[PDB]
Enzyme design. Structure first.
Site, PDB file in Angstrom:
ATOM      1  N   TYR B  51       0.844  -1.194   0.000  1.00 38.87           N
ATOM      2  CA  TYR B  51       0.000   0.000   0.000  1.00 38.87           C
ATOM      3  C   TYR B  51       0.877   1.240   0.000  1.00 38.87           C
ATOM      4  CZ  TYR B  51      -5.083  -0.282  -0.069  1.00 38.87           C
ATOM      5  OH  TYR B  51      -6.393  -0.374  -0.473  1.00 38.87           O
ATOM      6  N   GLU B  53      -0.432   4.792  -0.823  1.00 43.12           N
ATOM      7  CA  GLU B  53      -1.210   6.022  -1.002  1.00 43.12           C
ATOM      8  C   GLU B  53      -0.314   7.248  -0.831  1.00 43.12           C
ATOM      9  OE1 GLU B  53      -4.273   5.740   1.932  1.00 43.12           O
ATOM     10  OE2 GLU B  53      -5.697   4.770   0.578  1.00 43.12           O
ATOM     11  N   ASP B 197      -5.424  14.085 -25.230  1.00 37.74           N
ATOM     12  CA  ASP B 197      -5.406  12.671 -24.896  1.00 37.74           C
ATOM     13  C   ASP B 197      -4.607  11.929 -25.969  1.00 37.74           C
ATOM     14  OD1 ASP B 197      -5.905   9.976 -24.378  1.00 37.74           O
ATOM     15  OD2 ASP B 197      -8.049  10.248 -24.091  1.00 37.74           O
ATOM     16  N   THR B 223      -2.649   6.494 -22.243  1.00 35.07           N
ATOM     17  CA  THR B 223      -2.492   5.139 -21.746  1.00 35.07           C
ATOM     18  C   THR B 223      -1.036   4.753 -21.949  1.00 35.07           C
ATOM     19  OG1 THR B 223      -3.147   4.241 -23.906  1.00 35.07           O
ATOM     20  CG2 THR B 223      -4.849   4.411 -22.218  1.00 35.07           C
ATOM     21  N   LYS B 226      -0.624   1.339 -25.515  1.00 38.06           N
ATOM     22  CA  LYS B 226      -0.851   1.360 -26.965  1.00 38.06           C
ATOM     23  C   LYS B 226       0.483   1.425 -27.719  1.00 38.06           C
ATOM     24  CE  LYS B 226      -5.601   3.140 -26.585  1.00 38.06           C
ATOM     25  NZ  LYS B 226      -5.576   3.199 -25.093  1.00 38.06           N
ATOM     26  N   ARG B 232      -0.736  -2.174 -19.031  1.00 34.14           N
ATOM     27  CA  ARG B 232      -2.058  -1.570 -19.064  1.00 34.14           C
ATOM     28  C   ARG B 232      -2.215  -0.577 -17.911  1.00 34.14           C
ATOM     29  NH1 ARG B 232      -6.082  -2.543 -22.455  1.00 34.14           N
ATOM     30  NH2 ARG B 232      -4.744  -4.143 -23.405  1.00 34.14           N
TER      31      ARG B 232
END
Lengths: 405, 405
Positions: B51, B53, B197, B223, B226, B232
């Protein structure tokens, strides 16, 4: 690893540091666990290459025949595990699982009733700096000032006064069993949906050591990576009547392409949870948490709610005149990982706190038992009662080393 | 794999089917690629257990020293790759990257100008069944009916009429170079933020084969999976002045714990993209796309915009009196993976379409060159001109097999 050491020395060295750190330290972060090598192999698979928008048999890309099997295995195992009528295994996280449920039943500005964030509630349950508190009108219920148990009369009064469209039950730091029956009873009185966020207790629910929210809640959300001991991600369970709406909320609603490799790992994790040894594991988690609670009380520590029913406990540090922040920092110095945590009715801010949150899921996974719990508590006692003694801290450091081999 | 085959026969068998499928088929989905074994190993690491955060050096959990190095490597490499002043490598996906930018600069109901979804725009650019179109008031600009190139006078008129707070440039299916300078010029005229984008073209931007949106846009989203050929996930780039606000939007705004193992893989992918051979790779992607476009035109096919400047092309199937759906289905029968795609001013619905979208990123990764492009086009010609001939389809099937070995 084979190809990463050659391709990226910098990244490999950092990962190897993390691997060794995970072994060396006593991990008591309540939300953490250690996944199996099978779960990790699934995540490290070629399934990351596949775009699979939509759902099994109803995809918006061709060539999904095999990722469809993977996702169905995940959905069906989850349904077997929790007795749910429908599962959605696409949420990227607990945040996104909750986000999708809110997107399903609420309009912008709708009133929602959730657990007070300083009493145990999560950030996604109405924090004013989180989408939940910005997008929706969150009101809160509290725990009793003495017992630290949810005040169900307060839940009922807040619901009757504010008339929420949705009631959220469950917590990031609540050490006792939640009465989902009472939450549903109140929900029915005011005509509100009931969402249970079981992220923390999901593994215990699966093993039958915590009451199952499924028969009581319209929607059940969870992370896959806490007591459930799976990969990092989210999941939504619901009855058939909301199945279509929930699936639409995830896609095309709030997400795009799912992480098929993570979904593969989710299936693996659910497979493991269905086994008899996971039930035995989960009982040890709870037994260890009770033992650790008892042993800390023996050291002279006050615990929120006076103990625990689950995997986690909270130490009220006010009697020792310590902040959670101070306790967190000094325990870090000896190799014990906790997090500072607000206690109910905390006089301190959430950035300082009067408490620490401890969980047993991670240490139980690595094979720690009751005797280890006694020793962990004894070390914590030594540290927090002698914060100014470097010799006490060195002794603690050696005793931590003895435990982790 | 070692432990997954023993632990979960069902999941392992399905993954192995997918692995073999990825090798057997000709993969022409424009958004897909094949990651390196190093990227996958990073994703299959113990970093899923942590974790984390918050951000490097500013975490809300202890023990983050080594995942901090990993995240910083990802951020700094991305900044070197794209010349950006700040990077956020925590977005779980492209959807979440876009979501966070919208959360940063917009209030509920604010007007946003994006590319017409049937002209090339993405779902996250204002679809009425997506959070973007439900949460914000999206208006659209179009492409010229003849040239299929963005009509910048239309972008300007729509911006001047509707007065958006934000303009979104970039696409899921646009085969030509986007003029980010003109988008910024229009943005400045109406006092709107500019978001680009670059998800599809990110790898080409990094290799210098498409103009860089960074100097022109307030926010750049992408992303990582691609043309960038990474795991991903998502990423946000921006200038220092928005750095704090963007980081807050991701957490505690819209997400929770980041996927540290995926961030590790992002760093690996960025490391690879910084190398000379990725630049050569990306040029081959574009060269192959041009070659494939030319060879399809030679077969008698009409292409949207008359060709391509990038990795992707769109076939207008109206001259052959075929729907995109029909073309998609029959190509699936011979082992060629495309997706049906709306063409600008399509007389068909998005569920039927008059076109197919094709990209070269995946086939270029596996080593396909210009000669292979000529053959792929010849096979597509054979199939789509003889949809009713099972012998033509069997010939195509054999020729696909010859290409993939």
């Amino acid at each position: 690893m084979k190809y990463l050491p050659q391709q990226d020395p910098q990244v490999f060295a950092a990962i190897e540091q993390e691997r060794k750190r995970q072994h060396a330290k006593i991990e008591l972060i309540a939300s953490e666990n250690f996944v199996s090598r099978a779960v990790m192999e699934a995540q490290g698979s070629v399934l990351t290459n596949k775009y699979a928008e939509g759902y099994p048999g109803r995809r918006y890309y061709g060539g999904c025949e095999y990722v469809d099997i993977v996702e169905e295995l995940a959905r069906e195992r989850a349904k077997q595990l929790f007795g749910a009528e429908h599962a959605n295994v696409q949420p990227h996280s607990g945040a996104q699982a909750n986000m999708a449920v809110y997107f399903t039943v609420l309009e912008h500005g709708d009133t929602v009733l959730g657990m007070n964030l300083s009493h145990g509630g999560h950030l996604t349950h109405g924090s004013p700096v989180n989408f939940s508190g910005v997008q929706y009108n969150f009101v809160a219920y509290g725990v009793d000032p003495e017992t630290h148990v949810i005040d169900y009369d307060d839940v009922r009064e807040k619901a009757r006064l504010h008339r929420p469209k949705l009631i959220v039950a469950a917590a990031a730091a609540y050490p006792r069993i939640i009465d989902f029956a009472k939450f549903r009873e109140i929900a029915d009185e005011v005509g509100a949906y009931l969402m249970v966020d079981m992220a923390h207790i999901a593994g215990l629910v699966a093993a039958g050591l915590h009451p199952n929210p499924v028969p009581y809640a319209h929607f059940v959300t969870t992370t896959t990576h806490k007591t459930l001991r799976g990969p990092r991600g989210g999941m939504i369970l619901c009855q058939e009547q909301f199945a279509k709406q929930i699936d639409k909320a995830i896609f095309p609603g709030i997400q795009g392409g799912p992480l098929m490799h993570v979904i593969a790992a989710k299936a693996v994790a659910f497979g493991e949870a269905l086994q008899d040894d996971f039930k035995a594991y989960a009982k040890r988690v709870v037994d260890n948490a009770k033992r650790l609670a008892s042993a800390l009380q023996n050291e002279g520590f006050t615990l929120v709610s006076g103990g625990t029913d689950n995997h986690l406990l909270l130490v009220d540090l006010r009697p020792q005149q310590l902040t959670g922040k101070t306790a967190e920092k000094v325990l870090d110095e000896v190799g014990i990982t906790v997090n500072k945590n607000t206690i109910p009715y905390d006089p301190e801010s959430p950035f300082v706190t009067s408490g620490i949150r401890i969980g047993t899921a991670a240490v139980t996974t690595r094979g720690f038992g009751l005797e280890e719990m006694d020793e962990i508590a004894a070390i914590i006692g030594l540290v927090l009662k002698n914060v100014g003694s470097e010799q006490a801290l060195e002794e603690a450091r050696q005793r931590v080393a003895a435990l982790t081999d």
